[PDB]
Amino acid sequence: SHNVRHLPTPFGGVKGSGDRREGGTYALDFYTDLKTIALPLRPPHVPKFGK
Amino acid sequence: YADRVAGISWETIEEVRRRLKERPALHFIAGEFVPSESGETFPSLDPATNEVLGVAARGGEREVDRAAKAAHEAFQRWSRTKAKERKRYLLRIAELIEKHADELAVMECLDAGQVLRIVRAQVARAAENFAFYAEYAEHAMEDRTFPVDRDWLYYTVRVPAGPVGIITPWNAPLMLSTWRIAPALAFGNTVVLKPAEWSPFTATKLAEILKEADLPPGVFNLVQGFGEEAGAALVAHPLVPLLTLTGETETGKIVMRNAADHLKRLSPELGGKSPALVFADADLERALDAVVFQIFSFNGERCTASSRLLVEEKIFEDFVGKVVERARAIRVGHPLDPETEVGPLIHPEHLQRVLGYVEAGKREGARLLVGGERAKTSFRGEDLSRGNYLLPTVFVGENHMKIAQEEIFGPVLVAIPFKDEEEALRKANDTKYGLAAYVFTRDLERAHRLALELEAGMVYLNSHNVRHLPTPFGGVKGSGDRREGGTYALDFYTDLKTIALPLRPPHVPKFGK
Amino acid sequence: MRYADRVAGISWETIEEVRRRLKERPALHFIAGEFVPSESGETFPSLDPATNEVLGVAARGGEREVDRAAKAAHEAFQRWSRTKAKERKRYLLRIAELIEKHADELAVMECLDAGQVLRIVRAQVARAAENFAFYAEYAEHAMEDRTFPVDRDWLYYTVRVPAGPVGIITPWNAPLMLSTWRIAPALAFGNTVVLKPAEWSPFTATKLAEILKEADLPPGVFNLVQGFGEEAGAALVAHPLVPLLTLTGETETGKIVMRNAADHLKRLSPELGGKSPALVFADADLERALDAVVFQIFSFNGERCTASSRLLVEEKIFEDFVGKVVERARAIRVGHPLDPETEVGPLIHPEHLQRVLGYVEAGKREGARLLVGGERAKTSFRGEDLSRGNYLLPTVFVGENHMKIAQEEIFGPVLVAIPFKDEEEALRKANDTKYGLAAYVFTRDLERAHRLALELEAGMVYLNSHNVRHLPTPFGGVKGSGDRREGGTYALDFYTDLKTIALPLRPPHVPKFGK
Amino acid sequence: MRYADRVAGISWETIEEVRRRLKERPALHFIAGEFVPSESGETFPSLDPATNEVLGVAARGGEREVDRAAKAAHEAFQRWSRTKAKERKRYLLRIAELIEKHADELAVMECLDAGQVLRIVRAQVARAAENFAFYAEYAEHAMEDRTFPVDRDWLYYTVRVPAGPVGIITPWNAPLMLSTWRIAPALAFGNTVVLKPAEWSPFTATKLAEILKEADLPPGVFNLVQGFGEEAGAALVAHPLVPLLTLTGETETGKIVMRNAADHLKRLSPELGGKSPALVFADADLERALDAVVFQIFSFNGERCTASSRLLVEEKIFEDFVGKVVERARAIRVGHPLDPETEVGPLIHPEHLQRVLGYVEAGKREGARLLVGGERAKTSFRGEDLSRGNYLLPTVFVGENHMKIAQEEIFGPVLVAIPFKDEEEALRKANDTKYGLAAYVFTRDLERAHRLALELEAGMVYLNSHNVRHLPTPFGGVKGSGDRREGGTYALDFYTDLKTIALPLRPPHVPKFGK
Ligand SMILES: NC(=O)c1ccc[n+]([C@@H]2O[C@H](COP(=O)([O-])OP(=O)(O)OC[C@H]3O[C@@H](n4cnc5c(N)ncnc54)[C@H](O)[C@@H]3O)[C@@H](O)[C@H]2O)c1
Ligand SMILES: NC(=O)c1ccc[n+]([C@@H]2O[C@H](COP(=O)([O-])OP(=O)(O)OC[C@H]3O[C@@H](n4cnc5c(N)ncnc54)[C@H](O)[C@@H]3O)[C@@H](O)[C@H]2O)c1
Ligand code: NA
Numbered sequence A: 001s002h003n004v005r006h007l008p009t010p011f012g013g014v015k016g017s018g019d020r021r022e023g024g025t026y027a028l029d030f031y032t033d034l035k036t037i038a039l040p041l042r043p044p045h046v047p048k049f050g051k
Numbered sequence B: 001y002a003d004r005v006a007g008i009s010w011e012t013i014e015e016v017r018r019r020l021k022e023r024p025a026l027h028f029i030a031g032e033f034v035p036s037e038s039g040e041t042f043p044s045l046d047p048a049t050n051e052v053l054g055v056a057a058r059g060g061e062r063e064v065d066r067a068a069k070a071a072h073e074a075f076q077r078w079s080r081t082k083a084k085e086r087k088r089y090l091l092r093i094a095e096l097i098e099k100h101a102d103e104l105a106v107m108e109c110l111d112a113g114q115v116l117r118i119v120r121a122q123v124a125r126a127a128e129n130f131a132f133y134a135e136y137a138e139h140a141m142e143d144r145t146f147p148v149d150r151d152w153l154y155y156t157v158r159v160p161a162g163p164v165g166i167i168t169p170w171n172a173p174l175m176l177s178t179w180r181i182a183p184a185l186a187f188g189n190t191v192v193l194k195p196a197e198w199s200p201f202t203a204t205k206l207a208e209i210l211k212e213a214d215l216p217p218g219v220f221n222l223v224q225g226f227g228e229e230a231g232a233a234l235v236a237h238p239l240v241p242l243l244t245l246t247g248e249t250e251t252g253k254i255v256m257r258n259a260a261d262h263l264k265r266l267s268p269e270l271g272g273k274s275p276a277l278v279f280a281d282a283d284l285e286r287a288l289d290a291v292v293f294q295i296f297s298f299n300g301e302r303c304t305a306s307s308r309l310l311v312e313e314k315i316f317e318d319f320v321g322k323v324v325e326r327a328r329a330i331r332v333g334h335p336l337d338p339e340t341e342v343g344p345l346i347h348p349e350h351l352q353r354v355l356g357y358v359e360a361g362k363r364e365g366a367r368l369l370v371g372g373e374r375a376k377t378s379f380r381g382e383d384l385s386r387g388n389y390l391l392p393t394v395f396v397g398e399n400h401m402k403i404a405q406e407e408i409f410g411p412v413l414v415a416i417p418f419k420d421e422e423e424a425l426r427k428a429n430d431t432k433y434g435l436a437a438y439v440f441t442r443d444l445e446r447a448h449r450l451a452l453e454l455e456a457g458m459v460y461l462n463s464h465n466v467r468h469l470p471t472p473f474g475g476v477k478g479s480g481d482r483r484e485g486g487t488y489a490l491d492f493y494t495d496l497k498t499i500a501l502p503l504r505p506p507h508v509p510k511f512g513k
Numbered sequence C, D: 001m002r003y004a005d006r007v008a009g010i011s012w013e014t015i016e017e018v019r020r021r022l023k024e025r026p027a028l029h030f031i032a033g034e035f036v037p038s039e040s041g042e043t044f045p046s047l048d049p050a051t052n053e054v055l056g057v058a059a060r061g062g063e064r065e066v067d068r069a070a071k072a073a074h075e076a077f078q079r080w081s082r083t084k085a086k087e088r089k090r091y092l093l094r095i096a097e098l099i100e101k102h103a104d105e106l107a108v109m110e111c112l113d114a115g116q117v118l119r120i121v122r123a124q125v126a127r128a129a130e131n132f133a134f135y136a137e138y139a140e141h142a143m144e145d146r147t148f149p150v151d152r153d154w155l156y157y158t159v160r161v162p163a164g165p166v167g168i169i170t171p172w173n174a175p176l177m178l179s180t181w182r183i184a185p186a187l188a189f190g191n192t193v194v195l196k197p198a199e200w201s202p203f204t205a206t207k208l209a210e211i212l213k214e215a216d217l218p219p220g221v222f223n224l225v226q227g228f229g230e231e232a233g234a235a236l237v238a239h240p241l242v243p244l245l246t247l248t249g250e251t252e253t254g255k256i257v258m259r260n261a262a263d264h265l266k267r268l269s270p271e272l273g274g275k276s277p278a279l280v281f282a283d284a285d286l287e288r289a290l291d292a293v294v295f296q297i298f299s300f301n302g303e304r305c306t307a308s309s310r311l312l313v314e315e316k317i318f319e320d321f322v323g324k325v326v327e328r329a330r331a332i333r334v335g336h337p338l339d340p341e342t343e344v345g346p347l348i349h350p351e352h353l354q355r356v357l358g359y360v361e362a363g364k365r366e367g368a369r370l371l372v373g374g375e376r377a378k379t380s381f382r383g384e385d386l387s388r389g390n391y392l393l394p395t396v397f398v399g400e401n402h403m404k405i406a407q408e409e410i411f412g413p414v415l416v417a418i419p420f421k422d423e424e425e426a427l428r429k430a431n432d433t434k435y436g437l438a439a440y441v442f443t444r445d446l447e448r449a450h451r452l453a454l455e456l457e458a459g460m461v462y463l464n465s466h467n468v469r470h471l472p473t474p475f476g477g478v479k480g481s482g483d484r485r486e487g488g489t490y491a492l493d494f495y496t497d498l499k500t501i502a503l504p505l506r507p508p509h510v511p512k513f514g515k
């Protein structure tokens, strides 16, 4: 077929045609920043320095 | 990081020492160790004594060219090797790193100046990086299906992106190099590593190990040398489309600018000025331990160091005072000593830069509470004038100060006060960086609220930096872009492909009918 | 009594009109695209819980009506499951639009039929519309899944397909909201439907069918059969043409339905009973905690599955906090559903009031301390006589977790407060029931909160708040509270079937046999 | 008959040794960390399908044994579900390692007991080891799910927790592979286990228990109870302390089990029967197709659930293709399981052989045209007398899709060839079964292949190949072939419970009640 698009799919090129992707959730990787949040559920082990 | 680590036998240490000065650390290109065509080499100092530990081949654009061609030539076969086979190699590499752990530890301890109580964990993590990504090799092509009713089928897959140029820092040579090498190889890409000139030895050792694992020739290449020479050449080379960089922000700008020439994909993990926010309601005993460790461990030479300490005014005097006393008690000594907590900085030129910030801090009004000068004696009475030792330092200052705004990359902490949550957050985000942040408080809603508003790639609540490999690791703002870790690394090391196909005769517009 | 010109934004004129149409028009089944009575002509009445007077009648469906409905859903499944997702999306949006247009009628109807305060029922109509608007956006993603390529030798990919007609059996407390909760995803995902609503509040379902017909859904896609659980209900569960069954009701009903469903190995998605606990620690925001626990048990006349019927309070604050819960319960205004001043209305049916009162009596006899309520409400907040309706006074007991009133679901405005000396004991008692739907934790301590959230055996845990839902999250329970999940993509696992498709990219090695 | 010095890389000496060990050592239960016999002391024998002589005996477990096993699994669940994922991974890798270490013994044991060709059983042992090595890598990801933040007001996040003790009930054809297929995921995900293996081939299970004890799993984590389906099996299904149940067997058994499971609303993961079709089109690579269909039905002695028991061939090539299938079947070497040249061994039990012959007979009276086989194999390809074993000659019938032999699972080396006029018809007949496990399509046309793959009612569709599995993909069936999926992350939906945790980031609005 010819170029028939389904918007949710990752759209973009490789080599000299560019980088990154547009389309649904793939667009998210470019327009947003990921953040990892951590928290212990009980007193964790913390290395002792200067004790 | 255990509270106690075993020492390495005297004999092993002495054997590593002589092997380093006995033979130059060569490049590894197209399956074999070779020197630069010029025959030139450069020295690497032992930060504890500033004596030459050994020398490494001084690679230039000629060695990089051979390395890039080797990686390009081997990409065809490597990217097509079965994932299960690549997994086998990575697990083998992980096995061998464990087998040579003592050697690697001594090597990095002497070359980079990190203490054994930290290095042992680094070597273990280096092996873990390979064991970890080995399990992702078989899932490297996986993505999604996007069927449209009974008319079309769209499905996506991932393919290896291509040769990867890995430029690593001098603070944790093996750890940070394997962190990039492991995923790259797991995902079907070949590699050209360019180690920091201030700590080139563990890289050549890693190359020996990969050769012992019988990795196909050209798959992994190494080129020792200066950033301005071998480094710059690698960034500029047409056959290495991907570049990972771990270093200073300004270096990132230089690398990016030069990378534009070939529209290269970059994965930079740059600097940071990560803040630690301590609230009056937190477990202050745990907070004290966490903050002291997060800035002084790694000799303060790590991107995620909590170089700014924001403490709620009502407890500023008491808490910061306790931080000072702890820093004062830090054991400063030789890296090989298993009791040492803080060792010498990487090179005298770096110690000079750090002392420069200390002086600048004084000249701008910052109040020096402890340290701020070279360490003369160790916790064992040993004279430390021959090494690049800096005493753990603590300043009380303002967030807008130079020492609070720029990365020092040394065991130097700046304590800043805040009247309330709003101000703590404002000051925490008022930096050009955005790598990590630490929040100490017992209030549930305050914790999550701050975690959401803190501009950083990583936020740790009530603890020091404790990592879980599958999570996305990286920074925002001036701390870089892209993410490493599990499937998140996939987005950088591979390319997405959308494949479409109609399930029945589709509508095709008629032209020229 | 005309309490006001408008209630919940609805004119009193509309209220009287709806009441009149209910008495005039029998609630019929909707089968194969038409409203029809039972072949026997039989009907059953539905009472107005506020007066116990007959509101109207609904067709009494049986095996025959169910058989016709199932055949219709089955016959229509072929075409419906192949319609373009974009088109099904259009229908769901149309249904949501029409629910909004008939919002006033729906609110009044369900209010009169099930006894909840009008404004709350009105808000529920909005949620019902939202159910369709929400899933309308998942229809076009309903076939999506993953690819599992294996080097350059194989390509494995997975897709999802409509599972088949769904028999939806719902409870009497929230007819519109709880039925649309299942209907919307079923339709969005390409399945046909046969709804069998609770017999104690049948009207809203027949109205819903009218709306789906106004939305012009194809004939057979949506069918309705009114009737008793043991008659129309059991017939639907037993029918061989309805492979999927959703059930929202009592745990014991879950057992009966599953047993009956075994003959055809039907797939079941049960949302059953609950005895959700609220744990209040001395370090929490006690003002918010008080507002939350009072609301979470007494709102919706105590007839809410996620109600926090067990209140666990740390000992050091038990006397004061529980004392405050009691005074708030005492202040709750009890009255007619159509009175804007009412906070707690009447229970669904006199039989249900007798059951709830039976538990109140069980509690008194087993040693539980009755602090307030524990009997019929005689007079409304306005001084009206309420003896004709099924009104129960908000009730609070102080007891032990092993007591029957603590272990069994009462499903009425009845609360049992239980003390705990520490976190460990709060958790032990919280998990010590055969249920596991929801749990509520009130504490300001970060680590204790997440720790308890992870340890509490429940499908849903709310930290420092009442029940506030976010549709994309997985909803359901564990233990005796059911299985499976509803909500966004999680609903897909029940309404669709996964399929793994494989193909070699080059000639694979086929073991040679007989060659 | 000593066929060779070594078979499947196993010395004849080892074979003889395993054989005598079976006669000397009764297969005991493994409860609470120790091997024990039934309290009654009863046992039952297991036959050698090749000679129908007693190989040995296994403890006949009943309610008392199951009760003890269930209590052990329950008691151990508390600590096992709390062990660190990294530690459980170590255990599974240890088990995998020890399975490879005892591979020869396991291969012989199951070969002798279940009758499959030794080399095939040996390959299966490698797959069993792989089951543990595969799921070992998922243990550390077993709690993972999603986050659903709502602006700056709420944080909803979901996690998964171990669901509880799992009762695993397995079939007689492939003991080790099919039991480990469920045990591995169950343990990787934090659940304890009670295994109840098919009575016709009990030995391998007791050996597996010896291996897990060698891997030093904590007491009670893995339990085994030997016995009959209606005794030990039913007791396990009915036990209140075993909330989850995996069943791999006949569809009829699935109905019985679901009905029994209803009493405690147990979660079931059934992998039932099948009548998988192979569709061969005139445009396909007919040489590959021939190899594929011959293998897919006659391998594993025709006792494979995914066997392509129905062969749909396009009319214009029916005569030529089915003719070739027939000659290949005629050439298949029938003989002893320990003879390296044997392609087809004996069926599991004389009762099964007779059950299969029953269908063969039914097919004939039914009008099906027998082309080859259709009776007991009395002589091996070497001229040996096989009359004392349960050998069936590979069989091929030409029939109609509506015939009983086409509609019912025979579970033996019996094929039914059926013609079709076009794609439309091939699809119609392929789906017209009460089953829906697998399907195989042989055609070179891209659009027809994907089109058929999407429409074929089966959990797994293979294009232009025999059954080649990739573990991460969802495995299971639709309709009468079962429900739920196994494989990678898909197994998580059955072995764990989802939990939605919610917390406001700032004081939320709680409706005011009673004030
Ligand atoms: N988990 C949830 O999300 C949820 C939501 C709402 C209500 N509920 C629960 O529902 C209950 C209120 O239930 P209810 O009074 O409507 O009870 P119920 O179970 O008797 O009614 C539910 C449906 O079951 C049908 N039914 C009854 N017996 C049947 C049988 N033998 N075969 C087939 N169908 C049969 C009824 O006709 C009705 O439509 C409470 O326990 C409440 O906690 C749970
Ligand atoms: N879907 C799959 O992946 C798969 C895999 C292998 C075999 N199978 C199927 O399994 C069948 C072979 O089955 P089988 O001969 O072992 O049959 P079966 O169902 O009789 O045996 C399976 C298990 O069921 C137990 N069982 C029997 N009656 C029981 C009862 N009343 N209560 C509790 N447990 C009971 C048996 O003891 C045995 O361990 C075939 O139909 C085949 O298609 C399916
Ligand atoms: Na050095």
Ligand code: NA
Pocket (backbone or CB within 6 Å): C046, C047, C048, C049, C112, C113, C114, C200, C201, C202
């Ligand atoms: Na009613």
Ligand code: NA
Pocket (backbone or CB within 6 Å): C250
């Ligand atoms: Na009921």
Ligand code: NA
Pocket (backbone or CB within 6 Å): D046, D047, D048, D049, D055, D112, D113, D114, D200, D201, D202, D348
């Ligand atoms: Na046997």
Ligand code: NA
Pocket (backbone or CB within 6 Å): D250
């Ligand atoms: Na059987």
